[PDB]
C-alpha cells in the first residue's frame, strides 16, 4: 500500500496529525508549565482560569 | 349433466398469474452494491493504522 511505500512519510503525516490534535487539547487547558502534559502553553484554563 | 363432464376432463384456462410477491427488498445489498469489487485474488489485503 502506498502508506507502506513511505514509513518516513506515513509517520510524518502521522506525527503530523497526531501533533495537530495535541496542539489543539493542549490549548484548552494547559497550566503553563512545561512538563509534556502541558508544553508551556496556558491555553485558557491559564489563561482565562478554571472557575469563578 | 354433471357425469357427462367429468372433473378429469375439465382443464379450465387458468389466469397467467403467479403471486410470486416474496421480499426482495435488499437495500442493504443495494447500497455497496454497484461498488462490488470483483477480484481477480481471492484475499484482500489493506493497511489499519492502528495507533
Do not use: C, H
Amino acid at each position: 500500500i502506498s502508506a507502506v511505500r513511505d514509513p518516513v512519510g506515513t509517520a510524518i503525516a502521522d506525527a503530523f496529525d497526531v501533533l495537530s490534535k495535541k496542539i489543539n487539547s493542549v490549548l484548552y487547558t494547559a497550566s503553563g508549565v512545561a512538563d509534556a502534559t502541558n508544553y508551556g502553553i496556558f491555553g485558557l484554563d491559564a489563561a482565562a482560569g478554571t472557575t469563578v | 349433466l354433471t357425469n357427462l363432464t367429468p372433473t378429469e376432463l375439465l382443464a379450465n384456462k387458468a389466469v397467467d398469474y403467479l403471486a410470486n410477491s416474496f421480499l426482495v427488498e435488499t437495500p442493504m445489498l443495494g447500497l455497496l452494491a454497484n461498488r462490488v469489487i470483483n477480484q481477480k485474488q481471492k484475499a484482500i489485503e489493506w493497511g489499519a493504522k492502528v495507533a
